[PDB]
Structures are given as C-alpha cells and as structure tokens.
Amino acid sequence: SNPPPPETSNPNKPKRQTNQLQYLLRVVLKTLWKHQFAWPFQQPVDAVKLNLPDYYKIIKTPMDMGTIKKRLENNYYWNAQECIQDFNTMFTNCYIYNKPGDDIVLMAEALEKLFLQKINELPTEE
Numbered sequence: 001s002n003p004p005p006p007e008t009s010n011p012n013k014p015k016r017q018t019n020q021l022q023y024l025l026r027v028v029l030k031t032l033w034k035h036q037f038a039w040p041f042q043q044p045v046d047a048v049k050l051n052l053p054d055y056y057k058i059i060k061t062p063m064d065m066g067t068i069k070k071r072l073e074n075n076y077y078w079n080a081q082e083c084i085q086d087f088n089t090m091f092t093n094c095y096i097y098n099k100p101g102d103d104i105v106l107m108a109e110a111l112e113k114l115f116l117q118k119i120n121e122l123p124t125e126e
C-alpha cells in the first residue's frame with residue numbers, strides 16, 4: 001500500500017504570503033510544471049500502480065510537485081526556504097532511489113537545472 005500523502009493543510013501551522021513565496025509559485029513551480037518531463041513528479045509516487053514495493057522502505061520523506069503546488073496554493077508555508085527544501089527533497093529522493101542514468105534521473109536533472117536557475121534569482125524579501 002501507499003502511505004498517506006504529505007500534509008498540505010494545517011490550520012494551526014502559522015503561515016505567510018510573501019513576495020518570495022509568490023515567486024516560488026508564479027516562476028519556479030509554474031516553469032517546472034509545464035515542462036515535458038514534469039509528469040512523473042506531478043503527484044506522489046504511486047508505488048502500487050508503478051510496481052515499486054520497496055519505494056517507501058527507502059524513501060522516508062516523500063515529496064512531489066503536486067504536494068508543493070497544493071502547499072503554495074493553500075498558503076501552507078511560513079517562508080521560501082521551506083518550499084525550496086521541498087523541491088530539493090523531491091530531487092534527492094529520485095537520485096537516492098533510482099539507478100544512476102535511468103530516464104527518471106535524467107528527467108529530474110533537467111527539472112533541477114531549471115530550478116537552480118530560477119532560485120539563483122530569488123527576489124529580495126520585501
């Protein structure tokens with residue numbers, strides 16, 4: 001079976017709307033989401049349908065862009081570093097779980113290149 005997804009709603013978690021978080025949605029998430037290699041990353045890994053019974057034995061902090069998109073749209077975060085960490089966890093999980101050089105790793109690398117480019121120009125806090 002699959003685990004429950006990561007949390008995307010929590011009324012007692014303090015949160016904010018900030019210009020850096022707005023950039024993470026409007027620039028970072030949107031750029032990666034529209035990419036031709038986004039599809040395997042647009043929702044939690046479904047280890048049942050994809051026949052990956054060891055996935056959640058190895059990956060203990062799952063993360064995906066569907067979860068990030070919900071967190072950004074629902075104003076889940078306090079700061080941009082929490083969201084940047086989610087993206088980095090997503091990429092790292094893929095490199096940890098998969099065999100080097102597999103298609104999925106090349107896909108992650110292409111998305112990560114764009115991510116790094118956009119994060120390099122994260123705007124100053126207003």
Ligand SMILES: CN1C[C@H](CCn2c3c(c4ccccc42)C(=O)NCC3)CC1=O
Nearest residue numbers: 040041045050094097098102103104105
């Ligand atoms: C973020 N995700 C979603 C992947 C699911 C299974 N899946 C695998 C590959 C792949 C390529 C395209 C689409 C799905 C693919 C692949 O190239 N090698 C084996 C596992 C595993 C992973 O970490």
